Structure prediction request, 865 residues.
Amino acid sequence: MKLLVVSWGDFERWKETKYRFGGETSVGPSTLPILQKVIKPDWTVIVLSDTIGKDFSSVETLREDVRNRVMDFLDRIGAGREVDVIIAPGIGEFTHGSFRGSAMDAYYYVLHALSEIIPTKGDLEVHFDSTHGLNYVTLLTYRALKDLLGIAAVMNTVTFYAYNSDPFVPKITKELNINTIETTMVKPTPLSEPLPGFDEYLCPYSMERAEFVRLKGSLNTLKNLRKEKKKLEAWIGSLLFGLPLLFLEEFPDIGRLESYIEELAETWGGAIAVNAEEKAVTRRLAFGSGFGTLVKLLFQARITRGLLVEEPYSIEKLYSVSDRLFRGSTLQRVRVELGKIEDKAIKYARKGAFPRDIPLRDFLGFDAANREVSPRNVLAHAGLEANVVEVSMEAWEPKRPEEEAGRHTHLKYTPVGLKKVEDIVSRALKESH
Amino acid sequence: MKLLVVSWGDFERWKETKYRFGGETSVGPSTLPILQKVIKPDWTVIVLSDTIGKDFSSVETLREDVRNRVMDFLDRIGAGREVDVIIAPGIGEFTHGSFRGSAMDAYYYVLHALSEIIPTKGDLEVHFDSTHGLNYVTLLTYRALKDLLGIAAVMNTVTFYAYNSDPFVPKITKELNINTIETTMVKPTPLSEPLPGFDEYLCPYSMERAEFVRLKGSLNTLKNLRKEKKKLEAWIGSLLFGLPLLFLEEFPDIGRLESYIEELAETWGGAIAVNAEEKAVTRRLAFGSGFGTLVKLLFQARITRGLLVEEPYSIEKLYSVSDRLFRGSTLQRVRVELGKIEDKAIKYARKGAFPRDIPLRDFLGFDAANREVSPRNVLAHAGLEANVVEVSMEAWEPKRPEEEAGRHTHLKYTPVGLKKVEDIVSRALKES
DNA sequence: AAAA
DNA sequence: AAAA
Prediction:
């Protein structure tokens, strides 16, 4: 899958010129048709400001205005119609109207928008054109694009290209070259944020104290997230710290996450007052970092959902999950920890012993010296700490126990053990931020 | 230490407006004084396109012309004397001149320029303004800033703020708000890319390929990296994978890296052909990714230079280094591995035993026929693998061995061991 | 806790 | 809001 994103300003104010790209040449007011010809994308994404709209009779009338205007422009230029248009919440006081709100709303809106567009299965080749864009929309789109591709890179190969044209001077210009200003193999960056406090999901921009308190107080998200917070932070830490069993046991509910993001996005959408007479759009609620963290969390869940399996978790399963999620010394320490339990399972099996629901400490034959559960031992042993994990060997007739022990040996956090791991991994994720 | 960086285009064509920022107000043509007034920066940086240069005699009368007119404009609105001015190489075909070259040369030049300005000690509060910026220069300056602060974040606390004002619209404009577009705690990202092939340090933009090969041949830098490439990638791997002994032993020569960069820099600049009559700059050499990696490598070395402790490398010193350099699970892995060697060294000290110049396998007491050095065992055991490391205990009169053993127990790689580790860590960094 |  |  190849993906072309373009940051656009006011497209009706652009001059006809000549564009050079990949040896091909193009006459027109936009870089898009030559970008599509050369790159041949599987899908195109256009990101432009809300401020281009010229109708204030409704918020949806303001977006059907801007959309139709873009649909005309794509016909004027040789551009296709396989396109998604993201109408981002823009700021300022213009000749044809006024738009107030948090400037950071565009980041959270575009992040949320791109989250539902960027494919969650297979490799990504992403092309970003900034020739036509506004400074602050372009930077926040670049940032929102990168942050998601960083989570995509955990499971899949992600190459990122960025283009800007030669600068346009009124009449000195004859041909503009479309230059590659970036070419990057996106590094895998799993989410390393804790869920923030319940002030930083939706904030009041221009709203009376009592009215905001009623909206905030009405949200199912904040009520639910209060109790679900620790487990989601335990899962976030599972990817970051190299804990393959906690990844599986703490895999989040995608439906519930989808529910939280739609609820907040809708409260924000509904809190936009479009004053039809005096041509003013006021976004009376602003998105917080908490909304951003949730969007990223659900994206990481979608990216990695294919690894999840049913409740009996074998050492062979933890091996394969680990080889996908982890790299470098994190991966190799996990393989050594699974290896030590595997090699012990093999010894038991040679003797015709198949222990069931036994603590890992009793499985590996530890001393009675330490039963306390430290962050040191939890983090250092890929979360397979001796005092929290329970082991069960399903019985079989061994002929080559070296290769069949892995499938028949299962690991499980004790109900007490899981809560000790949750506290440690949650606290460590919050202390590392 | 608070830092302020601003992205500027053509600073003359801006009109008088007033600005609102953080419970203050200001009148003038740029946001810099009201930013300085609220932010209270210990230093200011200004990144410009060199395309605004008018007098074309040669390169020093372009970086003069622009620095002249920047310093005139900074007297007009009282920006003070605490300012650094980066005249980044721009491209295009303009009213008063023509600048040709690679679009990406601005990134590497600003990266290089920023690598020498940004403090390499103490916490950082970086403030960034995109109000006045060109499209590409602002985007590359932003990326250049983030790439360096990510490495700075390894050792210090780095908070980053970005600003862009309400859009200046000439009719119906009363006052523009300085909007905060970004506020983030910068995540520690240690350098995680190998040094490339000796192709991609300088590339010919507009140089006949026979001339480039001649020039690439006269560079001492590429001939010196030929040797060092592996030993430097091993050091890069040391930070990324949590290998504290390899970090100390492979610690790069800063004076030497300084001389590589300055040579690649002054070579690039010496291949800029200015033509006074045609009014045309041409940057015949382009900066490659290899130049960027060397600047980032040097910056990471400056950031972590304080940790290069005096020899020999004791368990106590390795703990101290590790406690500063590593986080999360990687730190605990390293602490557990130093704890294994420490606890053994205590058991030895109790019996009155102080082994000297002993392989770590013999120190820990290992079976035969596990002498093959696997990537698995080097990366998984904080690079302290039993077949590559040599332990020494300087004999002492113990009183509390549990406290004393850490100081008196030294670790080093065997001459053969270090090359296998270098090979393993270099290879692991390339598969990335 | 690698060959507690 | 193709160099506020």
In short: Chain B touches chain A through 62 residues (CB under 8 Å). Residues 336-337, 340, 361, 364-367, 370, 377, 380-381, 386 of chain B lie near DNA strand C (CB under 10 Å from a C1'). Residues 315-431 of chain B form one domain. The first strand of chain B starts at residue 2 and ends at 7.
